[PDB]
Amino acid sequence: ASAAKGDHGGTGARTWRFLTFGLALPSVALCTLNSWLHSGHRERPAFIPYHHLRIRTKPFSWGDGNHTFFHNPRVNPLPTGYEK
Amino acid sequence: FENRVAEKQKLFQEDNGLPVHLKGGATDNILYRVTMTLCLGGTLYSLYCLGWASFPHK
Amino acid sequence: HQTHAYHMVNPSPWPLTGALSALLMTSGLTMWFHFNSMTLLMIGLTTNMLTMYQWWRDVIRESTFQGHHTPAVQKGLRYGMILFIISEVLFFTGFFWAFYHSSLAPTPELGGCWPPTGIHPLNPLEVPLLNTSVLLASGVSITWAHHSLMEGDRKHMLQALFITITLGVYFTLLQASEYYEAPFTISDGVYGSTFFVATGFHGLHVIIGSTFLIVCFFRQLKFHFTSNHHFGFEAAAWYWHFVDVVWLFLYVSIYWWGS
Amino acid sequence: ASGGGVPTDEEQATGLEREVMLAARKGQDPYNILAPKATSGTKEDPNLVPSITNKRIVGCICEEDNSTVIWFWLHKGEAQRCPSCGTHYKLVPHQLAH
Amino acid sequence: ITAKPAKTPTSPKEQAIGLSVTFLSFLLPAGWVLYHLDNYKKS
Amino acid sequence: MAYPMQLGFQDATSPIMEELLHFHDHTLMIVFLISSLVLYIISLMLTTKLTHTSTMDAQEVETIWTILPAIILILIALPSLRILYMMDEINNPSLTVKTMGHQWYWSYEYTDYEDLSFDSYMIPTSELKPGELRLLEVDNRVVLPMEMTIRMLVSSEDVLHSWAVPSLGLKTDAIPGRLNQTTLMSSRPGLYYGQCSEICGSNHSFMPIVLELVPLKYFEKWSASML
Amino acid sequence: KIKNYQTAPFDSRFPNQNQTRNCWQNYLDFHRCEKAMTAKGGDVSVCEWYRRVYKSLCPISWVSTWDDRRAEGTFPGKI
Amino acid sequence: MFINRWLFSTNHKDIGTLYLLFGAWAGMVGTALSLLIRAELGQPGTLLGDDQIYNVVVTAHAFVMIFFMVMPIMIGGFGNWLVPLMIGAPDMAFPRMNNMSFWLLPPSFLLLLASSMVEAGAGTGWTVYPPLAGNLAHAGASVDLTIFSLHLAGVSSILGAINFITTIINMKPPAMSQYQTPLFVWSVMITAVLLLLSLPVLAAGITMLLTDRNLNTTFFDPAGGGDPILYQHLFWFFGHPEVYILILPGFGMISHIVTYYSGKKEPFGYMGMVWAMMSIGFLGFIVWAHHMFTVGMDVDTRAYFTSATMIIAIPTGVKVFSWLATLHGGNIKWSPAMMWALGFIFLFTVGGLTGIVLANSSLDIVLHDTYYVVAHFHYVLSMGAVFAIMGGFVHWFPLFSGYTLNDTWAKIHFAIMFVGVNMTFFPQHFLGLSGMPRRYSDYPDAYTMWNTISSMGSFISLTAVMLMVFIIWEAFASKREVLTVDLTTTNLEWLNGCPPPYHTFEEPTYVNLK
Amino acid sequence: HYEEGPGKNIPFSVENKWRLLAMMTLFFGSGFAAPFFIVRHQLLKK
Numbered sequence A: 001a002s003a004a005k006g007d008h009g010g011t012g013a014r015t016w017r018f019l020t021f022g023l024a025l026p027s028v029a030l031c032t033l034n035s036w037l038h039s040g041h042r043e044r045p046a047f048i049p050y051h052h053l054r055i056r057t058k059p060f061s062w063g064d065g066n067h068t069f070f071h072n073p074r075v076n077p078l079p080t081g082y083e084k
Numbered sequence B: 001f002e003n004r005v006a007e008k009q010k011l012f013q014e015d016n017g018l019p020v021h022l023k024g025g026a027t028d029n030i031l032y033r034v035t036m037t038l039c040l041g042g043t044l045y046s047l048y049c050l051g052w053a054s055f056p057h058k
Numbered sequence C: 001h002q003t004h005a006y007h008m009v010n011p012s013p014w015p016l017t018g019a020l021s022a023l024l025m026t027s028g029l030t031m032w033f034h035f036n037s038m039t040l041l042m043i044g045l046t047t048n049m050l051t052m053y054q055w056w057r058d059v060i061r062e063s064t065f066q067g068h069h070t071p072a073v074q075k076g077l078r079y080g081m082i083l084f085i086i087s088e089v090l091f092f093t094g095f096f097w098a099f100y101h102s103s104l105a106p107t108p109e110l111g112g113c114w115p116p117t118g119i120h121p122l123n124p125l126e127v128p129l130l131n132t133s134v135l136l137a138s139g140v141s142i143t144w145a146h147h148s149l150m151e152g153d154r155k156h157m158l159q160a161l162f163i164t165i166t167l168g169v170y171f172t173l174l175q176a177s178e179y180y181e182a183p184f185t186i187s188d189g190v191y192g193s194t195f196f197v198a199t200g201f202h203g204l205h206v207i208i209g210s211t212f213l214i215v216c217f218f219r220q221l222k223f224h225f226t227s228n229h230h231f232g233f234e235a236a237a238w239y240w241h242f243v244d245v246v247w248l249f250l251y252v253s254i255y256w257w258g259s
Numbered sequence D: 001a002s003g004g005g006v007p008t009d010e011e012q013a014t015g016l017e018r019e020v021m022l023a024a025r026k027g028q029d030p031y032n033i034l035a036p037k038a039t040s041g042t043k044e045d046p047n048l049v050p051s052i053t054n055k056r057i058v059g060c061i062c063e064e065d066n067s068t069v070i071w072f073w074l075h076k077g078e079a080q081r082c083p084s085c086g087t088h089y090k091l092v093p094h095q096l097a098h
Numbered sequence E: 001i002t003a004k005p006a007k008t009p010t011s012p013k014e015q016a017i018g019l020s021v022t023f024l025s026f027l028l029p030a031g032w033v034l035y036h037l038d039n040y041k042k043s
Numbered sequence F: 001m002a003y004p005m006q007l008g009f010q011d012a013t014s015p016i017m018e019e020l021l022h023f024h025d026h027t028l029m030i031v032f033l034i035s036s037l038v039l040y041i042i043s044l045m046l047t048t049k050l051t052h053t054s055t056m057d058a059q060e061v062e063t064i065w066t067i068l069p070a071i072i073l074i075l076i077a078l079p080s081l082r083i084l085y086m087m088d089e090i091n092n093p094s095l096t097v098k099t100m101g102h103q104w105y106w107s108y109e110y111t112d113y114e115d116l117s118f119d120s121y122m123i124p125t126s127e128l129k130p131g132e133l134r135l136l137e138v139d140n141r142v143v144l145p146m147e148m149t150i151r152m153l154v155s156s157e158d159v160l161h162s163w164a165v166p167s168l169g170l171k172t173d174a175i176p177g178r179l180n181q182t183t184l185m186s187s188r189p190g191l192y193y194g195q196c197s198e199i200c201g202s203n204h205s206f207m208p209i210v211l212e213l214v215p216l217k218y219f220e221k222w223s224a225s226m227l
Numbered sequence G: 001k002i003k004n005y006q007t008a009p010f011d012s013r014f015p016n017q018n019q020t021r022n023c024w025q026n027y028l029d030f031h032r033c034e035k036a037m038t039a040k041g042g043d044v045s046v047c048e049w050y051r052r053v054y055k056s057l058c059p060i061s062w063v064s065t066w067d068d069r070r071a072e073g074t075f076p077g078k079i
Numbered sequence H: 001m002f003i004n005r006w007l008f009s010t011n012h013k014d015i016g017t018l019y020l021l022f023g024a025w026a027g028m029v030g031t032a033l034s035l036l037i038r039a040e041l042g043q044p045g046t047l048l049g050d051d052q053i054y055n056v057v058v059t060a061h062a063f064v065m066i067f068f069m070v071m072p073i074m075i076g077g078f079g080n081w082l083v084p085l086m087i088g089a090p091d092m093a094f095p096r097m098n099n100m101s102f103w104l105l106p107p108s109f110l111l112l113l114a115s116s117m118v119e120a121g122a123g124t125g126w127t128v129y130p131p132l133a134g135n136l137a138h139a140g141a142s143v144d145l146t147i148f149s150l151h152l153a154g155v156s157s158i159l160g161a162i163n164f165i166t167t168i169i170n171m172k173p174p175a176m177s178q179y180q181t182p183l184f185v186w187s188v189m190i191t192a193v194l195l196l197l198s199l200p201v202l203a204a205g206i207t208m209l210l211t212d213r214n215l216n217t218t219f220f221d222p223a224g225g226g227d228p229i230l231y232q233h234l235f236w237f238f239g240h241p242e243v244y245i246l247i248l249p250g251f252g253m254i255s256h257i258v259t260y261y262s263g264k265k266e267p268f269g270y271m272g273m274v275w276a277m278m279s280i281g282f283l284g285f286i287v288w289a290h291h292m293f294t295v296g297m298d299v300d301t302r303a304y305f306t307s308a309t310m311i312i313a314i315p316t317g318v319k320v321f322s323w324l325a326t327l328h329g330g331n332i333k334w335s336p337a338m339m340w341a342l343g344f345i346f347l348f349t350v351g352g353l354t355g356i357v358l359a360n361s362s363l364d365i366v367l368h369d370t371y372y373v374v375a376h377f378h379y380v381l382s383m384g385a386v387f388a389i390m391g392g393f394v395h396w397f398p399l400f401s402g403y404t405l406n407d408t409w410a411k412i413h414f415a416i417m418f419v420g421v422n423m424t425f426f427p428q429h430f431l432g433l434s435g436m437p438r439r440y441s442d443y444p445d446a447y448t449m450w451n452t453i454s455s456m457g458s459f460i461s462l463t464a465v466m467l468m469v470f471i472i473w474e475a476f477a478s479k480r481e482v483l484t485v486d487l488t489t490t491n492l493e494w495l496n497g498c499p500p501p502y503h504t505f506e507e508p509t510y511v512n513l514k
Numbered sequence I: 001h002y003e004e005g006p007g008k009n010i011p012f013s014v015e016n017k018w019r020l021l022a023m024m025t026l027f028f029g030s031g032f033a034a035p036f037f038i039v040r041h042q043l044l045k046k
């Protein structure tokens, strides 16, 4: 490909700055717009004690040894089901 | 800010026979002794931990 | 006197302290994992930080201050960095191999399907796409920083490098948020396993790359870099691209194709 | 869109890096970064081997594309010949650092 | 290769001593452990 | 089983193992030839006062010692691959038996019709009956019909194990969560031995496999009574 | 009826040494079939083949485990 | 001054020395471990206990011989000592990082000793396969300490590889092309590239095992949808290249020893030797599954791996025949070193050839996990690798120390070891064909004779090891200082005297470009 | 700067052949003995 733009006669500092502010950052702003729009907590799914999930072959070296490191009560059930 | 590299160049090229890790002054000495103490101490501590775990506590 | 351009390094204690810090951390993790104690691990991490700081400090002293980095010494450092990145790539290779092995032939325990039964994948068009535009954008800004530095523009080099770092931090925060919002955990089978371990390690590389960039930032402020000699910056930038590229693969494989 | 403030090598290079740079500028090579071009190697036109002492190890690649290199100490004095191809080498002692 | 005469010659007697000491340093400790192997197995 | 002072392979009990004995003989000859050729050449180079220390040209003899070995390899690969594919041939078995490896014994399941299954443990040295083989006897043998194509499925319920029977040329790893297949066909009636072939802990050396090959008829009665 | 089964015949879909899927597939197929028939008012006897096959190939413990899970509601497979 | 020199070193020679000392000590540990194995197998019955303690010994024997003896000696020892001297370099590119490669080893070795001290040790085999290595069949710290030991050993090697490759590419005389560097230098670089590419995969794999054992991941656990066979692939992808990593530097030394004692100024077919090491190194990355012929793979896959594995015999053949062509027409000096090199050429070929037997998946079904494999690898390692180390050791000892060894004693040592190793491993081919499995503390009665002879052979080897320690003492005790060495015109490492000064090549060599 | 030449480029002393014999005997003897004692250690735990 060749993109859809042009320059190339001499790729220098001004050109890359132009790309930072004119392409790169605006793209980040659009994806920031889209993301903080499609967010919103999705209704947590019903708990089913599936044997291939919530694995516990050895307790974690922290807490009560049953909570994952970034455990989120709202969405991460314990092997026995969601928390109170 | 101002460019003070020249000063630092002078200090580090100063012929005092000091190895680069201590050529910056007394602080280097301190940091070194702290580092070395932690390493040697922790290592000793680690040997103790090994000795402890080597035997059954039934 | 020497009539060659190579660097004869002053006897240093850093290799030993680093070696010992390695022993303290591995020993430390074992102590943590089995004898419920973090003391050793704590000391290990500390001596390690101390070692790295002093070791690289000396490297800056030997180069910027002592002039030991002749074109030949610098040429060697380029090779060293390229070889280092290569081994880091191969390390990831093992993880991508694990991912593809598990995802292409889902076992009966997963319900013979991918993603496994009971796993609800994040949407690749949401935070993952954002994360992607963030890293790609930092790639553009770091390139502007490089050209600014080569063109002798101090202000704009600092400006661009700062933007790059912010983006790296932004990515790191977004990813930590995602880890917390994720309905699945590392304990959720081979899917959780491959996901967090791969993106986990990549997350760590991003943190390291960022730190490297920050070091360059401060060395820039202190005028360490000349418009023609700034290998520390070049290495940090190569490392940054490496990190960016690994993300693209994670994105395409785990987040997009793997959902 | 542009400005300055970043040092140059000419303004900031120090130590050996600086010497190599200055030497290179004069068209010299005190730090052996370049490979010396050979003379005819005859008794009359020997290869001049710079040195800072009274002897220097010489490596002779007798014929182009040879994989074996002939090594020997070239001493101060009468020209010596490669034990393999017989080309001549003569040591031309000291200086470098004024 | 050419070399100078031994600066501190090791007589045949001396060599018997080094050899014997060397062999024993390997053989003794091991032999002791191996000897008491039954005293270890059940104790 | 192996006999005292055995040098080669245990006698072939299946057509495939026979095939392998012949292939191994073929291979071993080449190995012997090449190794003795090399030892000979070494002694030839070291037994003459004549010398030639000047530069020797290589782009000529390298052709010889590149093409020759290449040919020799093809001479080994052909019959090797013929036998490999032969082992993969579709055969359509008359019976299917499963074996699960456990720490430290094997369990067997003949579930084609009835739900027959049993554990197979090594007979302790102290409880061996006179004439019985130390470390090799098991309480319950794997009774199977002779001269019939049997499908053996292997797996494990804990760590890895490997189900092997040398006289038949068999060795299939017992991996938990996996079902490995192999075909068994004994040309003769008898007792055929094997041992766990994958490190599995404390008693890896003590969990043998003993097959009892009998005529179809006896196999049937045996099935019935093992209910 | 069209039976007289000895053992599970070679299945061209699973021609290699790894038969894990062969057992799995047949176990699935049987319980899927048994479901639709017990559903639409039909005879489960048509599902007989798959039961024989998975019976032959599947280790007792796998079948047992799978059966226990279908009952518990935690069977990962789609039936 | 002592600490500055031996603990804060930045000198390639001193670092190489430290490596030699470490490897020598490690070799004693591995020998002790090997003797314990043969003692247990010396007579039917149980000597130490069940398979657990026995396999903790078998596992340790392997890690120690491989990671602490062979690699430190060949790569860290001979590599650091000779590479700079052979290209006329003042030192290595990253002299400080080099020092760290060394200091990571004692810690790494410590973790290994720890692992065997705590709990019931790690009786897993050096391959450390799950589930046996998992937190259920091997609960406790043992296996975790073993993984950590490998991690440290791995970083040490990766750091060393980065240093060697950079030094060899960037620090040769300006006029010297890569096609003008000695074969040992080539061997070291190729080994380094193999390390750089393979160890990271190993690291990935043992990390996944660590997390399965400690963070509830299920990479190799079917319950979570994992696969024990995934581990085997990751392990062996590193494991095969590793065996080539263990032999390549040996190939390099053999080329130098054979050329030297043949009174030749160069090895036969230099470019053919370079091509051969590169091909071997490459092929070594695409043949790993030959260690998994019984796990149950598709027939096509097994046919590919049989073929790819056999091809390696071609480049290896070129090397063997070239060493013979180097001996051809030479004024042979029957030195102890030459003897080790000749034994190497023969014994290695044997082990390589039986390696070719095993490459046939068909036959491997029956030979896999039997003593035939143990016989194959001990010929190439305990005879190949080890003989290259011994030959290199006696040849260069005078260079490193400044003293000469007693030649007659060295010849006696060679003879004892030769008998020992052959008596130990030859009969194992028999035990293999007849079905004796690997990793067994006891065996059926029929295997008694060969196991008895093998163990006797191992004691002979022990006598040889003890003798060598004495011989090294006698050299240092008598102090016969070196005067002159022959063939220096084609052996640059000797040109600075014995031992060379702390700093060599302060003034680089002179090399015309013409 | 450091000592150079035979017997000086090493971390142990070779001044006295007997003191040296002792060093070497401890050095290699310790390495060789280690496995035996660890085995004893393991048998003495249970």
Ligand SMILES: CCCCCCCCCCCCCCCCCC(=O)OCC(COC(=O)CCCCCCCCCCCCCCCCC)OC(=O)CCCCCCCCCCCCCCCCC
Residues within 6 Å of the ligand: F007, F008, F009, F028, F031, F032, F035, F036, F039, H350, H354, H422, H423, H426, H427, H429, H430, H433, H453
């Ligand atoms: C130590 C115990 C020995 C027991 C011996 C046999 C007793 C037989 C009774 C009675 C004998 C007759 C009745 C039984 C016949 C059985 C035939 C069989 O089933 O057949 C298969 C069997 C038996 O094979 C044989 O048919 C035995 C072959 C023996 C070759 C020996 C070379 C020995 C050299 C030096 C002595 C050994 C140590 C050094 C070995 C050094 C490496 C070879 O199993 C093998 O395949 C074993 C070998 C595996 C491959 C090694 C390959 C390269 C080896 C040597 C090349 C040397 C070349 C130069 C020539 C040799 C130069 C040195």
Ligand code: HEA
Residues within 6 Å of the ligand: H020, H023, H024, H027, H028, H031, H034, H035, H037, H038, H058, H059, H061, H062, H063, H065, H066, H069, H070, H124, H125, H126, H127, H374, H378, H381, H382, H385, H386, H389, H390, H393, H421, H424, H437, H438, H439, H440, H441, H458, H461, H462, H465
């Ligand atoms: C380099 C590798 C190496 C070496 C040299 C050896 C050497 C020996 N090995 Fe082994 N061995 C392995 C690597 C090695 N081994 C591996 C990887 C395994 C498999 C592990 C597993 O199954 O998991 C194994 C397995 C193994 C088994 C099979 C265990 C089983 O399946 O139950 C046996 C059995 O007899 C054995 C015996 C021996 C013996 C008696 C020696 C003797 O020949 C040793 C004699 C002494 C030496 C060769 C040491 C000499 C070197 C030095 C001491 C350096 C000296 C100092 C200087 C020069 C400076 N080894």
Ligand code: HEA
Residues within 6 Å of the ligand: F034, F038, F068, F069, F070, F072, F073, H127, H243, H244, H246, H247, H290, H291, H293, H309, H310, H312, H313, H314, H316, H317, H318, H320, H348, H349, H350, H351, H352, H353, H355, H356, H358, H359, H360, H364, H367, H368, H369, H373, H376, H377, H380, H381, H384, H385
């Ligand atoms: C120094 C170490 C070393 C080296 C270089 C090799 C080299 C080779 N190895 Fe081996 N190997 C090991 C160490 C080594 N190996 C170890 C440690 C194991 C077991 C690991 C474990 O499970 O613990 C092992 C296991 C092993 C296996 C697995 C067996 C099993 O577990 O069932 C196989 C399979 O193919 C094999 C093959 C080969 C081959 C084909 C070579 C080839 O590279 C050899 C090529 C050499 C020659 C062929 C000889 C010289 C050539 C000629 C004279 C030319 C003419 C030849 C012909 C025409 C054939 N090796």
Ligand SMILES: CCCCC/C=C\C/C=C\C/C=C\C/C=C\CCCC(=O)O[C@H](COC(=O)CCCCCCCCCCCCCCCCC)COP(=O)(O)OCCN
Residues within 6 Å of the ligand: A068, A069, A070, A071, A072, A076, C029, C172, C175, C176, C179, C180, C181, C182, C183, C184, C185, C186, C187, C196, C197, C199, C200, C201, C203, C204, H151, H152, H154, H155, H203, H207, H210, H211, H215
């Ligand atoms: C913010 C993004 C960046 C990620 C990293 C940041 C913080 C975590 C701390 C260290 C991580 C460094 C590397 C990755 C190692 C393990 C995977 C971690 C990735 C991670 O952080 O995964 C988390 C799991 O945490 C866990 O167990 C983690 C448990 C933490 C202990 C670390 C375990 C130490 C093991 C390291 C092995 C070292 C070997 C490496 C050797 C390299 C070569 C020699 C995910 O959280 P969760 O609740 O399960 O699911 C989310 C549900 N809401």
Ligand SMILES: CCCCC/C=C\C/C=C\C/C=C\C/C=C\CCCC(=O)O[C@H](COC(=O)CCCCCCCCCCCCCCCCC)COP(=O)(O)OCCN
Residues within 6 Å of the ligand: C075, C078, C079, C082, C083, C085, C089, C092, C093, C096, C238, C241, C242, C243, C245, C246, C249, H165, H193, H282
């Ligand atoms: C599905 C899997 C998922 C995982 C995927 C994850 C990530 C993707 C992978 C990669 C992307 C990452 C980063 C890319 C960005 C920058 C890298 C830096 C490159 C750079 O910018 O390189 C420059 C030039 O090219 C040079 O080096 C050229 C010289 C190179 C020298 C070093 C190489 C030496 C090593 C061995 C040599 C190999 C030999 C080849 C022949 C073998 C035949 C088989 C710097 O100069 P220098 O060293 O002085 O050389 C002088 C030659 N001009």
Ligand SMILES: CCCCC/C=C/C/C=C\CCCCCCCC(=O)O[C@H](COC(=O)CCCCCCCCCCCCCCC)COP(=O)(O)OCC[N+](C)(C)C
Residues within 6 Å of the ligand: F041, F055, F056, F057, F058, F061, F064, F065, F068, F069, H321, H322, H324, H325, H328
């Ligand atoms: C699977 C196993 C494979 C089996 C291997 C088979 C081995 C090959 C067997 C024979 C090879 C034949 C090569 C013939 C070359 C002639 C030898 C000769 O004589 O060597 C030189 C040729 O140079 C040259 O090729 C250089 C010198 C000779 C070059 C070749 C010598 C090496 C041959 C191999 C050495 C033995 C190792 C064999 C390995 C198995 C001599 O030079 P000229 O006469 O011009 O000058 C002398 C002056 N005049 C003119 C007055 C006489």
Ligand SMILES: CCCCCC/C=C\CCCCCCCCCC(=O)O[C@H](COC(=O)CCCCCCCCCCCCCCC)COP(=O)(O)OC[C@@H](O)CO
Residues within 6 Å of the ligand: C093, C097, C100, C101, C102, C104, C105, G016, G018, G020, G021, H298
């Ligand atoms: C690379 C260029 C050279 C080209 C040669 C080709 C070699 C490798 C690339 C091919 C990879 C894709 C092939 C997948 C297609 C088959 C799908 C499949 O299903 O394969 C799967 C595994 O593939 C997997 O993970 C595959 C995982 C990858 C393994 C390959 C290892 C090499 C990686 C290291 C290279 C470093 C590169 C640096 C990166 C820039 C599972 O195995 P099966 O046996 O089917 O089990 C199913 C049974 O139930 C029935 O028998």
Ligand SMILES: CCCCCC/C=C\CCCCCCCCCC(=O)O[C@H](COC(=O)CCCCCCCCCCCCCCC)COP(=O)(O)OC[C@@H](O)CO
Residues within 6 Å of the ligand: C025, C048, C052, C056, C057, C059, C060, C063, C064, C069, C077, C207, C208, C209, C211, C212, C215, C224, C225, C226, C229, C230, C231, C232, C233, C235, D012, D013
């Ligand atoms: C929470 C955060 C903590 C996490 C742990 C890791 C922390 C930080 C890692 C970030 C790496 C910082 C590295 C800074 C390096 C500074 C030294 C430097 O950049 O040194 C430069 C050389 O390159 C060189 O050595 C290049 C040196 C390359 C090193 C980069 C490699 C990354 C290493 C990661 C190691 C992690 C280990 C963890 C162990 C458990 C100096 O040469 P120039 O720049 O040309 O200067 C000369 C001019 O002034 C002349 O005019």
Ligand SMILES: CCCCCC/C=C\CCCCCCCCCC(=O)O[C@H](COC(=O)CCCCCCCCCCCCCCC)COP(=O)(O)OC[C@@H](O)CO
Residues within 6 Å of the ligand: C007, C009, C018, C019, C021, C022, C025, C026, C048, C051, C052, C055, C058, C059, C062, C063, C068, C073, C077, C080, C081, C084, H093, H094, H095, H096, H097, H098, H148, H151, H152, H155, H162
């Ligand atoms: C379970 C936990 C396992 C933990 C294992 C940890 C092992 C070690 C931890 C401590 C190591 C950190 C301390 C700093 C190391 C810096 C090496 C460095 O920066 O070395 C440089 C060379 O490599 C270059 O450039 C290019 C390459 C730079 C490589 C940087 C070092 C990274 C270490 C990799 C280990 C990562 C471990 C994995 C962690 C996730 C500089 O070369 P020197 O010889 O110094 O000097 C030469 C002079 O001319 C400089 O003026």
Ligand SMILES: CCCCCCCCCCOC1OC(CO)[C@@H](O[C@H]2OC(CO)[C@@H](O)[C@H](O)[C@@H]2O)[C@@H](O)[C@H]1O
Residues within 6 Å of the ligand: E027, E028, E029, E030, E031, E032, E034, E035, H035, H036, H039
């Ligand atoms: C695999 C490597 C090992 C190879 C085999 C070792 C070779 C022989 C070593 C001899 O060593 C010893 O001999 C003893 C017996 O001869 C012991 O003494 C013991 O036995 C006695 C006499 O029977 C007593 O007098 C003492 O109390 C005693 O403990 C014992 O201490 C030991 O040092």
Ligand SMILES: CCCCCCCCCCOC1O[C@H](CO)[C@@H](O[C@H]2O[C@@H](CO)[C@@H](O)[C@H](O)[C@@H]2O)[C@@H](O)[C@H]1O
Residues within 6 Å of the ligand: A061, A062, A063, A064, C025, C029, C032, C038
């Ligand atoms: C190779 C590169 C990487 C090297 C290894 C990586 C090192 C990772 C360190 C992890 O350490 C931690 O461990 C903990 C456990 O000890 C935590 O505390 C916690 O754990 C507890 C102790 O049981 C609780 O009291 C608390 O709630 C708390 O979350 C914790 O925050 C975190 O810092």
Ligand SMILES: C[C@H](CCC(=O)O)[C@H]1CC[C@H]2[C@@H]3[C@H](O)C[C@@H]4C[C@H](O)CC[C@]4(C)[C@H]3C[C@H](O)[C@]12C
Residues within 6 Å of the ligand: F059, F060, F062, F063, F064, F066, H271, H272, H275, H318
């Ligand atoms: C061309 C190249 C280097 C020659 C040089 O520039 O000196 C040489 C070195 C080794 C040679 C190879 C090795 O000798 C091995 C092979 C020998 C066969 O005679 C031809 C192909 C063969 C694969 C050779 C092809 C080519 O002549 C190679 C690759």
Ligand SMILES: C[C@H](CCC(=O)O)[C@H]1CC[C@H]2[C@@H]3[C@H](O)C[C@@H]4C[C@H](O)CC[C@]4(C)[C@H]3C[C@H](O)[C@]12C
Residues within 6 Å of the ligand: C101, H230, H233, H289, H300, H301, H304, H305
């Ligand atoms: C063994 C490995 C898969 C490892 C894993 O299961 O994770 C697989 C992936 C791709 C396979 C390769 C590719 O599918 C291409 C080739 C296909 C042929 O039928 C066999 C050899 C062949 C060269 C394969 C060998 C082997 O089975 C490979 C390399």
Ligand SMILES: *N(C(=O)NC1CCCCC1)C1CCCCC1
Residues within 6 Å of the ligand: C087, C088, C089, C091, C204, C205, C208, H158, H199, H200, H201, H203
């Ligand atoms: N990886 C590596 O050094 N890259 C990163 C890893 C995270 C911490 C900073 C460096 C290694 C490559 C070789 C194998 C082990 C990982």
Ligand code: CUA
Residues within 6 Å of the ligand: F101, F102, F104, F160, F161, F162, F196, F197, F198, F199, F200, F201, F203, F204, F205, F207
């Ligand atoms: Cu079961 Cu070994």
Ligand SMILES: [Cu+2]
Residues within 6 Å of the ligand: H239, H240, H243, H287, H288, H290, H291
């Ligand atoms: Cu291999």
